[PDB]
Structures are given as C-alpha cells and as structure tokens.
Amino acid sequence: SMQEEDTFRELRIFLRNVTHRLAIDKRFRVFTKPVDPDEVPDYVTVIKQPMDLSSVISKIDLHKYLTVKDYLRDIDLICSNALEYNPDRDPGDRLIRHRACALRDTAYAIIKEELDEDFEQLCEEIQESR
Ligand SMILES: CC(=O)c1csc(NC(=O)[C@H]2CNCCN2CCC2CCC(F)(F)CC2)n1
C-alpha cells in the first residue's frame, strides 16, 4: 500500500544514514570499497562472498533490504569476512580484526540507540505478509 511503501522508504533513509556514518569513519576505510585483485590477489579466492559498504549502499537503493535484520546480515558479513581473511597474529591482521569488530559493534549500537523497535517489527510484519 501507500502506507507500506512509506514505511520502506523511511527504512531506506535510516539505513543510508547509518551506512554513511560508518563510511566516513576513518577506522572503517578498508571496508568502504571492494578489494582490488591487483593489490590483494589471494582475496577473491579465500572470501567466497565479498561485501563492503559501497555494495551495501547500492543494495539499499535497489530496495534489497526490507528489514533491519537483512541489513545487519550484510554488516555481519563484512565483519566475518574480515576476521576470516585475517586470522594471523601479525599486527596488520589484528588491526583489521579490531576495526571489523568495531564496525559491527558501532552499527549495532546505532540501531539499538536510534531505531524504534516497533518500527523494525512493522517492517517485519509488512514483509511476512508478502
Ligand atoms: C577487506 C579485508 O578484510 C582486507 C583487505 S586486505 C586485508 N588484510 C591484509 O591484506 C593483511 C594480511 N596479513 C598481512 C597484513 N595485511 C595488511 C594489513 C594492513 C592493516 C592496516 C591497514 F590499514 F588495513 C592496511 C593493511 N584484509
């Protein structure tokens, strides 16, 4: 309905705002764009399902997220991909893992602080009725 398309538009506006706040944070620059095979050859062969914040923004604009949980699944994938690709004790690996955990925790804390829980439930219920 018109009331339902209004709800999904508000969700997209909200998810764009959260994603932008993540993307301008200097800690998360490694997560803002896809990994260049020129510069990281092993990546596209260790990580079967790439994800980054530019790809999240494109999915929002393609109406691919109908619930906050669907969005957080791709945030969780950015983080779990980073932990999986950087398992070593090397300080470079520990640094990326630290930032990956901070990206995940920051997204969750923004949602917990600023999203109404009745709003997420409305999104769920509209979606389960389709
Ligand atoms: C998207 C993703 O998960 C990803 C992309 S490259 C990668 N990690 C690396 O290539 C690790 C591998 N082991 C050796 C050290 N490397 C670089 C660490 C160094 C940390 C600071 C920095 F600013 F990030 C530059 C990179 N991970």
Side-chain angles (χ1 to χ4, degrees), residues 1 4-25 27-32 34-47 49-68 70-130:
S1 81
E4 295 183 339
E5 293 319 301
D6 279 357
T7 294
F8 287 135
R9 194 170 176 263
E10 179 169 352
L11 172 68
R12 289 192 302 271
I13 290 165
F14 174 72
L15 296 176
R16 268 185 218 105
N17 176 256
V18 174
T19 307
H20 183 247
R21 285 147 75 187
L22 299 179
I24 67 175
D25 189 318
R27 297 173 293 171
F28 305 147
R29 155 181 269 280
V30 65
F31 309 120
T32 55
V35 175
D36 192 341
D38 294 341
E39 141 175 44
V40 185
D42 289 2
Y43 193 74
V44 316
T45 88
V46 187
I47 297 311
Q49 198 183 1
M51 192 50 59
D52 66 279
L53 297 174
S54 75
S55 308
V56 169
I57 288 283
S58 308
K59 286 179 74 163
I60 293 166
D61 290 349
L62 295 170
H63 297 26
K64 297 282 184 210
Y65 301 121
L66 305 174
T67 61
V68 169
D70 293 342
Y71 172 90
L72 287 175
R73 194 172 309 129
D74 274 351
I75 298 302
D76 286 321
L77 177 61
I78 298 180
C79 180
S80 68
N81 281 353
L83 304 173
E84 182 188 327
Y85 190 67
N86 298 271
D88 299 330
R89 64 91 51 211
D90 157 43
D93 285 31
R94 302 199 130 122
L95 175 52
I96 293 180
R97 294 208 303 278
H98 190 267
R99 295 169 166 172
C101 290
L103 172 85
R104 185 201 59 218
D105 297 343
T106 297
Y108 272 85
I110 289 171
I111 276 47
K112 177 162 172 219
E113 252 167 81
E114 309 182 11
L115 185 78
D116 194 312
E117 79 191 0
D118 294 328
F119 186 84
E120 169 55 340
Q121 182 61 30
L122 179 63
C123 288
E124 304 264 25
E125 277 185 31
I126 301 177
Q127 180 213 49
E128 298 158 11
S129 82
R130 293 184 176 177

